[PDB]
Write an enzyme that holds these catalytic residues in place. Structure first.
Site, PDB file in Angstrom:
ATOM      1  N   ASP A  50      41.324  28.506  42.865  1.00 23.88           N
ATOM      2  CA  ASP A  50      40.159  29.388  42.759  1.00 23.88           C
ATOM      3  C   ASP A  50      38.991  28.748  42.018  1.00 23.88           C
ATOM      4  O   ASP A  50      38.914  28.780  40.784  1.00 23.88           O
ATOM      5  CB  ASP A  50      40.557  30.709  42.092  1.00 23.88           C
ATOM      6  CG  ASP A  50      39.462  31.734  42.139  1.00 23.88           C
ATOM      7  OD1 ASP A  50      39.651  32.843  41.609  1.00 23.88           O
ATOM      8  OD2 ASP A  50      38.373  31.411  42.687  1.00 23.88           O
ATOM      9  N   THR A  51      38.037  28.225  42.791  1.00 27.96           N
ATOM     10  CA  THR A  51      36.858  27.594  42.214  1.00 27.96           C
ATOM     11  C   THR A  51      35.955  28.575  41.478  1.00 27.96           C
ATOM     12  O   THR A  51      35.109  28.141  40.686  1.00 27.96           O
ATOM     13  CB  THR A  51      36.051  26.884  43.299  1.00 27.96           C
ATOM     14  OG1 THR A  51      35.633  27.819  44.304  1.00 27.96           O
ATOM     15  CG2 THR A  51      36.872  25.800  43.942  1.00 27.96           C
ATOM     16  N   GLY A  52      36.085  29.877  41.730  1.00 29.85           N
ATOM     17  CA  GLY A  52      35.320  30.862  41.007  1.00 29.85           C
ATOM     18  C   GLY A  52      35.891  31.270  39.670  1.00 29.85           C
ATOM     19  O   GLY A  52      35.253  32.026  38.935  1.00 29.85           O
TER      20      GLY A  52
HETATM   21  C1  LIG Z   1      46.659  42.032  44.872  1.00 30.70           C
HETATM   22  C2  LIG Z   1      45.236  42.453  45.364  1.00 30.70           C
HETATM   23  O1  LIG Z   1      44.631  43.250  44.384  1.00 30.70           O
HETATM   24  P1  LIG Z   1      43.036  43.655  44.561  1.00 30.70           P
HETATM   25  O2  LIG Z   1      42.738  43.793  45.973  1.00 30.70           O
HETATM   26  C3  LIG Z   1      41.994  42.268  43.907  1.00 30.70           C
HETATM   27  O3  LIG Z   1      42.877  41.154  43.749  1.00 30.70           O
HETATM   28  C4  LIG Z   1      42.193  39.961  43.388  1.00 30.70           C
HETATM   29  C5  LIG Z   1      42.187  38.756  44.327  1.00 30.70           C
HETATM   30  C6  LIG Z   1      41.455  37.494  43.929  1.00 30.70           C
HETATM   31  C7  LIG Z   1      40.723  37.422  42.573  1.00 30.70           C
HETATM   32  C8  LIG Z   1      39.929  36.116  42.138  1.00 30.70           C
HETATM   33  C9  LIG Z   1      38.479  36.504  42.059  1.00 30.70           C
HETATM   34  N1  LIG Z   1      38.062  36.939  43.387  1.00 30.70           N
HETATM   35  C10 LIG Z   1      37.443  38.254  43.641  1.00 30.70           C
HETATM   36  O4  LIG Z   1      37.145  39.037  42.762  1.00 30.70           O
HETATM   37  O5  LIG Z   1      37.247  38.503  45.063  1.00 30.70           O
HETATM   38  C11 LIG Z   1      36.858  39.843  45.409  1.00 30.70           C
HETATM   39  C12 LIG Z   1      35.714  39.674  46.514  1.00 30.70           C
HETATM   40  O6  LIG Z   1      36.602  39.174  47.748  1.00 30.70           O
HETATM   41  C13 LIG Z   1      37.784  39.859  47.633  1.00 30.70           C
HETATM   42  O7  LIG Z   1      38.816  39.056  47.853  1.00 30.70           O
HETATM   43  C14 LIG Z   1      39.648  38.964  46.482  1.00 30.70           C
HETATM   44  C15 LIG Z   1      39.117  40.175  45.613  1.00 30.70           C
HETATM   45  C16 LIG Z   1      37.869  40.466  46.066  1.00 30.70           C
HETATM   46  C17 LIG Z   1      37.538  35.316  41.759  1.00 30.70           C
HETATM   47  O8  LIG Z   1      37.892  34.286  42.601  1.00 30.70           O
HETATM   48  C18 LIG Z   1      37.643  34.908  40.275  1.00 30.70           C
HETATM   49  N2  LIG Z   1      37.033  36.010  39.465  1.00 30.70           N
HETATM   50  C19 LIG Z   1      35.776  35.613  38.778  1.00 30.70           C
HETATM   51  C20 LIG Z   1      34.607  35.748  39.831  1.00 30.70           C
HETATM   52  C21 LIG Z   1      33.290  35.268  39.139  1.00 30.70           C
HETATM   53  C22 LIG Z   1      34.454  37.193  40.298  1.00 30.70           C
HETATM   54  S1  LIG Z   1      38.169  36.750  38.394  1.00 30.70           S
HETATM   55  O9  LIG Z   1      39.628  36.927  39.114  1.00 30.70           O
HETATM   56  O10 LIG Z   1      37.506  38.134  37.858  1.00 30.70           O
HETATM   57  C23 LIG Z   1      38.370  35.635  36.960  1.00 30.70           C
HETATM   58  C24 LIG Z   1      39.458  34.573  36.951  1.00 30.70           C
HETATM   59  C25 LIG Z   1      39.558  33.668  35.735  1.00 30.70           C
HETATM   60  C26 LIG Z   1      38.574  33.851  34.546  1.00 30.70           C
HETATM   61  C27 LIG Z   1      37.540  34.906  34.588  1.00 30.70           C
HETATM   62  C28 LIG Z   1      37.408  35.819  35.810  1.00 30.70           C
HETATM   63  O11 LIG Z   1      36.775  34.870  33.398  1.00 30.70           O
HETATM   64  C29 LIG Z   1      37.312  33.885  32.644  1.00 30.70           C
HETATM   65  O12 LIG Z   1      38.451  33.238  33.439  1.00 30.70           O
HETATM   66  C30 LIG Z   1      40.729  38.631  41.644  1.00 30.70           C
HETATM   67  C31 LIG Z   1      41.464  39.898  42.044  1.00 30.70           C
HETATM   68  O13 LIG Z   1      42.708  45.078  43.790  1.00 30.70           O
HETATM   69  C32 LIG Z   1      42.267  45.052  42.449  1.00 30.70           C
HETATM   70  C33 LIG Z   1      42.645  46.346  41.784  1.00 30.70           C
END
Ligand SMILES: CCOP(=O)(COc1ccc(C[C@H](NC(=O)O[C@H]2CO[C@H]3OCC[C@H]32)[C@H](O)CN(CC(C)C)S(=O)(=O)c2ccc3c(c2)OCO3)cc1)OCC
EC number: 3.4.23.16
Lengths: 99, 99
Positions: free
Chosen positions: B25-27
């Site tokens: 996860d690059t984000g």
């Molecule tokens: C089992 C399914 O549960 P779910 O559906 C949701 O699951 C998830 C699936 C993937 C991820 C990874 C997150 N992706 C995302 O938010 O993508 C959304 C938009 O596209 C969709 O696809 C995925 C979800 C939707 C990003 O890559 C990374 N994020 C930071 C970004 C700037 C936002 S981070 O995780 O907040 C984070 C990680 C490390 C850190 C930090 C913050 O700060 C310091 O270190 C989170 C949750 O329901 C929830 C109730």
């Protein structure tokens, strides 16, 4: 280009005619941008992140240029902490992970 | 290897002597993993994203192997909906974005 990950992979995007900064996010299925005005119809949608679910405006078939590369796809607008470019658009510009 | 983004970039990791699946996860600035008992001391932390914040335990100098590549760094453990390998470890295995 080749982008290393010692810093956040932030890039300039062009959407609705305006330039913004966004994070290339391989952990995001979808593209989510902070509150803005976009032309075109939109439908209410919900998306879940690390902390729970938020309400977004779903815009379909939106033109967006990412570091010069063109994509046309779905853009969600809502209270995200940062503009994120998700896999739905990363695949259109030919992005891969390599190590 | 080269990992396309048509589907979620899921890989097998080895941590604390156990095998798990996680997203490249690059984000993600930091690495966040599902609840697990890691030995050693830890510090409380809060991390935020879409939907708000979750409470996690910060462990330092943790050994993780990612598809044969070894990395050592901080791992956050808590009630996360998905396991993510963040940039702090991706840089160590030489992972880049390419388009
Ligand atoms: C089992 C399914 O549960 P779910 O559906 C949701 O699951 C998830 C699936 C993937 C991820 C990874 C997150 N992706 C995302 O938010 O993508 C959304 C938009 O596209 C969709 O696809 C995925 C979800 C939707 C990003 O890559 C990374 N994020 C930071 C970004 C700037 C936002 S981070 O995780 O907040 C984070 C990680 C490390 C850190 C930090 C913050 O700060 C310091 O270190 C989170 C949750 O329901 C929830 C109730």
């Amino acid at each position: 280009p080749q982008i290393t990950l010692w810093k956040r992979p932030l890039v300039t995007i062009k959407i609705g005619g305006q330039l913004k900064e966004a994070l290339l996010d391989t952990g995001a299925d979808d593209t989510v941008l902070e509150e803005m005005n976009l032309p075109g119809r939109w439908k209410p949608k919900m998306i879940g992140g690390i902390g729970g679910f938020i309400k977004v405006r779903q815009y379909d078939q939106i033109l967006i240029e990412i570091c010069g590369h063109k994509a046309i796809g779905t853009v969600l607008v809502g209270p995200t902490p940062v503009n994120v470019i998700g896999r739905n658009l990363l695949t259109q510009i030919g992005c891969t992970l390599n190590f």
